[PDB]
UniProtKB/Swiss-Prot annotation:
Protein source organism: Homo sapiens (Human)
Site (Cleavage): D8, A9
Upper lineage: Eukaryota, Metazoa, Chordata, Craniata, Vertebrata
Protein origin, superkingdom: Eukaryota
Effect of E35A: Enhanced protein autophosphorylation due to enhanced substrate presentation in trans
Site residues by UniProt (Breakpoint for translocation to form PCM1-RET): L13, E14
Outcome after substituting L162V: In MTC; confers resistance to nintedanib inhibitor
Phosphotyrosine: modified positions: Y107, Y110, Y181, Y186, Y262
Domain called Protein kinase: residue spans: 25-294
Phenotype when changing V105L: In MTC; familial form; confers resistance to vandetanib, lenvatinib, cabozantinib and nintedanib inhibitors
Effect of Y92F: In HSCR1, pheochromocytoma, MTC and MEN2A; familial form
Protein name, UniProt field: Soluble RET kinase fragment
Amino acid sequence: GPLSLSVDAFKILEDPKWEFPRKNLVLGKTLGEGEFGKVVKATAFHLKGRAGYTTVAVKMLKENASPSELRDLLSEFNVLKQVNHPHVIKLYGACSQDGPLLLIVEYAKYGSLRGFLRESRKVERALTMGDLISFAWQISQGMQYLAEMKLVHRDLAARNILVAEGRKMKISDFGLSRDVYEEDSYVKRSQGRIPVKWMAIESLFDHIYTTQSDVWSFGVLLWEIVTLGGNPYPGIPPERLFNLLKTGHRMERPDNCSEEMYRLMLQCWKQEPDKRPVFADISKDLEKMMVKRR
Ligand SMILES: Nc1ncnc2[nH]cnc12
């Protein structure tokens, strides 16, 4: 089938640019477990030209992986080989030869944006609205880049953004990302694996994913940022989202949120995907709020 073809092709592809000697990689503590796989802290000796050890993160399959999970890891590898942006997690290499598939990626010392925000508060860690706006802007910059590359991320959420040295955002978790060069849309007959509460109305009902459904997810992400890692649609069961969204309901303006910021969220969640802003516009709106605050 499609996966068996991918695995065979992968196992023969002589890939000197990305292949890394397993013996030069030492794995450490678990940093997290996504639904497709797990990430562990690691160190790699003589990685891509750097003398000595470099601390990295390593993505691998969980125990008892399914074909779905294996497909997603292979896909993430294939996507990450083609992307290069300061706000997208960087790929360093892979170990594929004499053991389980390991992807070697950039380590982000602060962990997920969600965890970073929830440990904070607005003025443990002290964040200003300026900082919050900055975070969103960096993510929007990254997304503009991916959208230009005709990639749809599909799984944008604070748990999928990492925070690197200098509080720099890194979009991560490309296992569900898909190329839309030919049709500008990705459509799947089967039920998706993205959490319901982050999905655009047309993804939930019609299984259509585009850059403008990424924009909807960004609006949920914006809400998570503004609420310092709140839970979307709190107390509302996911099965209720079909009716709630189709009848035009959206999350209300949260506390410590300007009318301008809330307006941007609502715009991300317009029923009609064509009425939603593009990432370029999102970046311009955020930069504007940043300078108006000074
Ligand atoms: N690449 C990564 N770097 C740091 N912490 C992480 N948690 C999950 N993935 C991570």
